[PDB]
């Protein structure tokens, strides 16, 4: 696998060089944010169940047909599959967020996902939608926590977004 640190290393390796001082300063800074980074993750994990639950409700309010006979989220088993999937995607996203790198997400999760969905007949569009719905709810928590020292998390928040979006895009 890969993450922010390892990555920079690898790059450096092919040049054949010690790490540039400039490059260290990326990592040095990254460290400093750690605490923020962590809490972000913690927030997702803490609220996981909910995040999904929520997103689902909204997804089905919008696309009523998914839950109608002939739709893709019917019958029960399909609905369960759909829920399961949403969760998974989330799980990965979180992982990435900690790593500070998309990779884990791309390789385990996104890679081949679209085509799977296609073969099954799952409407990729809707999947993507769900991912976004999730995104918003998730940010909601990341950004509004309780008992945490107040400061600016934007930087992290945006990176979070990006991950969600890579997801949305590749699925779609």
């Amino acid at each position: 696998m890969q993450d922010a640190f390892t990555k920079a290393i690898v790059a450096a390796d092919l040049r054949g060089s010690f790490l540039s001082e400039q490059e260290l300063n990326q990592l040095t800074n990254l460290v400093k944010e750690s605490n923020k980074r962590l809490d972000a993750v913690n927030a997702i994990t803490g609220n996981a169940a909910e995040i999904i639950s929520d997103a689902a409700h909204k997804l089905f309010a919008e696309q009523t047909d998914l839950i109608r006979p002939g739709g893709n989220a019917y019958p029960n088993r399909r609905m369960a599959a759909c829920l399961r999937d949403m969760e998974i995607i989330l799980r990965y996203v979180s992982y990435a967020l900690l790593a500070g790198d998309a990779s884990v997400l791309e390789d385990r999760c996104l890679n081949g996902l679209k085509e799977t969905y296609v073969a099954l007949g799952t409407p990729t569009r809707s999947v993507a939608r769900a991912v976004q719905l999730m995104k918003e709810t998730a940010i909601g928590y990341v950004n509004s926590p309780s008992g945490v020292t107040r400061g600016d998390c934007s930087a992290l928040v945006n990176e979070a977004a990006t991950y969600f979006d890579k997801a949305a895009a590749s699925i779609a």
Binding site: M1, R77, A81, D107, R108, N111, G112, V118, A119, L120
Partner: protein
């Protein structure tokens, strides 16, 4: 008249050698026996490593010494040795963490049973299994399953069952496994350009039945 070179005049072997499946077709089976010479042990060990890891190259550092010792004392059977290899950092790093679960399932299917996946349901039972319980419980479900026990149940190294008619086979294994095997020098490799990707296309699965769930 009843003896005359047919006009086709293909050999017996011909059909296999043209596909490149000549070694795997009726593959030889390696069994560990109740008391084993130092060579039988080392054959079995080489055969397992080659079959589980998909002819990918295992260095001298990659080997797992303990599992091999236990196999030497007699304290674990070959079937247990297989589980230890399968449940291992090295296996997980090659065929699990870099690929997608759809890709992994078809790999493990091939590694632990020489066939490819028979139909779409096989992906459902193994993907849900993985979310419910570990990787580990999933891997067990393979070795634990009756098909693993029925063939190569104990003390026998797993061998490719693909490319030969097996009872209750689906059609279109033959072709599917040809996508997975791809020749005696090929090997599935975490570390090739464009990463680790499924060969089996998902639309041919549905071509075999797809029930609800």
């Amino acid at each position: 008249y009843y003896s005359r070179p047919a006009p086709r005049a293909t050999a017996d072997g011909d059909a296999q050698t043209k596909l490149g499946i000549t070694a795997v077709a009726p593959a030889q089976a390696v069994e560990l026996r109740p008391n084993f010479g130092e060579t039988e042990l080392q054959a079995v060990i080489r055969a397992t490593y080659k079959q589980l890891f998909g002819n990918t190259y295992i260095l001298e550092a990659d080997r797992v010494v303990q599992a091999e010792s236990l196999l030497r004392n007699g304290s674990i059977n070959v079937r247990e040795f297989v589980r230890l290899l399968a449940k291992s950092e090295l296996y997980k790093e090659r065929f699990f963490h870099c690929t997608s679960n759809n890709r992994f399932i078809e790999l493990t299917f091939k590694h632990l049973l020489g066939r490819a996946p028979y139909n779409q349901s096989e992906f459902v039972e193994h993907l849900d299994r993985y979310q419910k319980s570990g990787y580990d419980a999933e891997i067990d479900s393979y070795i634990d399953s009756d098909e693993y026990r029925r063939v190569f149940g104990e003390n026998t190294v797993p061998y490719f069952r693909g490319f030969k008619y097996q009872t209750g086979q689906a059609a279109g294994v033959f072709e599917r496994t040809l996508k997975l095997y791809g020749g005696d020098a090929d090997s599935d490799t975490n570390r090739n350009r464009q990463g680790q990707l499924r060969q089996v296309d998902p639309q041919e699965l549905l071509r075999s039945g797809r029930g609800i769930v």
